Amino acid sequence: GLPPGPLENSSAKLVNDEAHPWKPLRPGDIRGPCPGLNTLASHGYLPRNGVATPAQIINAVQEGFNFDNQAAIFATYAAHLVDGNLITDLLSIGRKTRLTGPDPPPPASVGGLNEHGTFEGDASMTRGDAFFGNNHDFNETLFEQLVDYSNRFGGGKYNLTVAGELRFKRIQDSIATNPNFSFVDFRFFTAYGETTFPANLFVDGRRDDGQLDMDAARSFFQFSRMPDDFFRAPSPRSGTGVEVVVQAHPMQPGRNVGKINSYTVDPTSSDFSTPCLMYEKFVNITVKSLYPNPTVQLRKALNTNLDFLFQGVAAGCTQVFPYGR
Ligand code: HEM
Ligand SMILES: *[C@@H]1O[C@H](CO)[C@@H](O)[C@H](O)[C@H]1NC(C)=O
Ligand SMILES: *[C@@H]1O[C@H](CO)[C@@H](O)[C@H](O)[C@H]1NC(C)=O
Ligand SMILES: *[C@@H]1O[C@H](CO)[C@@H](O)[C@H](O)[C@H]1NC(C)=O
Ligand SMILES: *[C@@H]1O[C@H](CO)[C@@H](O)[C@H](O)[C@H]1NC(C)=O
Ligand SMILES: *[C@@H]1O[C@H](CO)[C@@H](O)[C@H](O)[C@H]1NC(C)=O
Ligand SMILES: c1ccc2ccccc2c1
Ligand SMILES: [Cl-]
Ligand SMILES: [Mg+2]
């Protein structure tokens, strides 16, 4: 289906309402590394089993949290291209599942959002790096560190100042302990933007003050649960204030090189000075490597989803065509 358009009415409103109650997981229900999508699934904005179409995801993030349309489109189609089934039009928000349908040939994995190194990556705030055994479940120790950083830099609340400090701490801890730490290209971008999301989108929209309390933070991050009487944000947004996070501790893209404490800058990586390069590499390298010589129906589905992806790219970039026009 076509990517949904922006909300017709983007005002703050109660989104923890009678039609969207929180419910606990049933056997088989999938949750993954994204507390936003997890919460939407657990309130029935998405299918409660955690398997959805790109159109369902875009509608849910807009309706439930007032995520902006351009950001919704880019993130959703990027995730779907690398982790979803392009023939069935289904994506798991967590683990790989037979529910997304018959798989394409390798090297495409259709591994859901839990797939390491496609969309998901290292130095997440409340999830551990994949090297340490689990890149998707809520981690209490990491959450308590978020609480500590909120106490130290946010007066007990999570805000952009806290984000700036915690983002850097998680990078430096991965450098020190994960010999396979990777922090380039698509992950380098998403790792920064995601740290703004709790301040921009988990804060009740009647306040919209960028100060997230720890009871609400735990409810979303651990339980995929909106606070009682939760109002969504009062206007469309995603990553506003990411400049504050970057400015706190500016980093270059790079990786550890098979050993701890060996962070080596990658000059081939995109960075914030080259946002169109991030898009071009994502298509030409990441997507193309998963689908190097697709058959007829796959090629068509790739091109459709790549056209939708490009709708989410900030104006100024040139579309690239790995499988022709
Ligand atoms: C629009 C479609 C979306 C997709 C496809 C998506 C996907 C993802 C993925 C794969 C991750 C894991 C990255 C990582 O930390 O390794 C992630 C993290 C995150 N997502 Fe989303 N997401 C979307 C929308 C949202 C929305 C609307 C919110 C908030 C309302 C949100 C909040 C977050 C947060 C806070 C994290 C970081 C978790 C952490 O580091 O502990 N996301 N998302
Ligand atoms: C938009 O929705 C809000 C909150 O649900 C409502 O109060 C407002 O009147 C709506 N705007 C229009 C033009 O209907
Ligand atoms: C190690 O890093 C590479 C990317 O540099 C990635 O393909 C691989 O999945 C990583 N594995 C883990 C467990 O981090
Ligand atoms: C959570 O994160 C901590 C700190 O990185 C790690 O030591 C621990 O093994 C992780 N998992 C659990 C289940 O606590
Ligand atoms: C975060 O909270 C602390 C303490 O209230 C404050 O000094 C700082 O200015 C806040 N930052 C933002 C971006 O709101
Ligand atoms: C991506 O491939 C296109 C050709 O389809 C080429 O023009 C473009 O320069 C490539 N970009 C990168 C970053 O490789
Ligand atoms: C993770 C998930 C969703 C996103 C949307 C826009 C930009 C970066 C993101 C990173
Ligand atoms: Cl929008
Ligand atoms: Mg991660």
UniProtKB/Swiss-Prot annotation:
Question: What residues form the membrane-spanning segments?
Answer: none
Domain of life of the organism in this record? Answer: Eukaryota
- Its Enzyme Commission number(s) read 1.11.2.1
Q: Which InterPro entries match?
A: Chloroperoxidase (IPR000028), Chloroperoxidase-like_sf (IPR036851)
**Keywords from the named record:** Disulfide bond, Glycoprotein, Heme, Hydrogen peroxide, Iron, Metal-binding, Oxidoreductase, Peroxidase, Signal
> Which residues carry attached sugars according to the database record?
9, 139, 159, 180, 284
MF annotations from Gene Ontology: heme binding; metal ion binding; peroxidase activity
Kindly provide the PTM information from the record.
N-glycosylated.
Cofactor, free-text remark: Binds 1 heme b (iron(II)-protoporphyrin IX) group.
pH dependence (record): Optimum pH is 4.7 with ABTS as substrate. Optimum pH is 7.2 with benzyl alcohol as substrate, and there is another optimum at pH 6.2. Optimum pH is 7.2 with dimethoxyphenol as substrate. Optimum pH is 6.0 with naphthalene as substrate. Optimum pH is 7.0 with pyridine as substrate. Optimum pH is 7.0 with veratryl alcohol as substrate, and there is another optimum at pH 5.5.
Q: Kind of enzyme, top EC level? A: oxidoreductase
Q: Which residues bind heme?
A: 34
| Record field: catalytic activity | RH + H2O2 = ROH + H2O
Q: Which cysteines are joined by disulfide bonds?
A: 276-317
So which cofactors does this thing need?
Answer: heme b
Q: Which GO terms describe its biological process?
A: hydrogen peroxide catabolic process
Which Gene3D superfamilies does the UniProt entry name for this protein?
Chloroperoxidase-like (1.10.489.10)
State the family named in the UniProt similarity comment for this chain.
Belongs to the chloroperoxidase family.
Q: What does this protein do?
A: Aromatic peroxidase that oxidizes aryl alcohols into the corresponding aldehydes and then into the corresponding benzoic acids. Oxidizes toluene and naphthalene. Catalyzes the regioselective peroxide-dependent hydroxylation of propranolol and diclofenac to 5-hydroxypropranolol and 4'-hydroxydiclofenac. Catalyzes the regioselective peroxide-dependent hydroxylation of naphthalene to 1-naphthol or 2-naphthol via a naphthalene 1,2-oxide intermediate. Catalyzes the regioselective peroxide-dependent oxidation of pyridine to pyridine N-oxide. Halogenates monochlorodimedone and phenol.
PANTHER family found in the cross-reference section? HEME HALOPEROXIDASE FAMILY PROFILE DOMAIN-CONTAINING PROTEIN, STERIGMATOCYSTIN BIOSYNTHESIS PEROXIDASE STCC-RELATED
Protein name (database record)? Aromatic peroxygenase
Q: Which organism is it from?
A: Cyclocybe aegerita (Black poplar mushroom)
